[PDB]
Amino acid sequence: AKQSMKAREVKRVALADKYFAKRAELKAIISDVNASDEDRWNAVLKLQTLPRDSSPSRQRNRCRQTGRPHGFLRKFGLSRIKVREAAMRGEIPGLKKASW
């Protein structure tokens, strides 16, 4: 695996643990509504242009045996062929293929 992808993983997971203060997560609660008509602001976002690339985007868990994103299945964490090969051996917890 390329250090360029590993360095972006090491950034993407660290921007998910940069801020903990209740102003840095204000976009989870300030666009909330109970009633319509007229503007509320015009510029209450006073500490929310300082964050960069911290919002949840492009999150991956990949093929957990090889680290590859290619052809992996979300319900197993394995490749679209390893889901047979490991079940033919009985390794997958609670699942078997052939001769059972």
């Binding site: 052809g71 679209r80 062929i81 917890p93 609670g94 699942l95 078997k96 059972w100």
Partner: protein, 98 residues
């Protein structure tokens, strides 16, 4: 009043999992009906057919889930402890209905 359910991805692991909740109470309560089988359902699943770079074709991938209601009805605090000890077991899934 509680009801409990058991799920498995194999037609036989589900029976040795029933052995940890029904036959652990064979001397510790009233009788329990032999398990009603229920439908195994279609729920068709698909995968890309070649290991790499082919995308014009997709294969079927045949898998089914077994669901059992086990006829055991309302549990004692001991049968709840036996059920929560099966919630600690891998390869199967237990569910509670209220």
């Amino acid at each position: 009043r509680i009801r409990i359910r058991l799920k498995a991805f194999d037609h036989r692991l589900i029976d040795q999992a029933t052995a940890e909740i029904v036959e652990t109470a064979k001397r510790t309560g009233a009788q329990v009906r032999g398990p009603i089988p229920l439908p195994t359902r279609k729920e068709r699943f698909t995968v890309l057919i070649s290991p790499h770079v082919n995308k014009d074709a997709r294969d079927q991938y045949e898998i089914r889930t077994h669901l059992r209601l086990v006829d055991i009805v309302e549990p004692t605090e001991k049968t709840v402890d036996a059920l929560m000890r099966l919630d600690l077991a891998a390869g199967v899934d237990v569910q509670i209905s209220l």
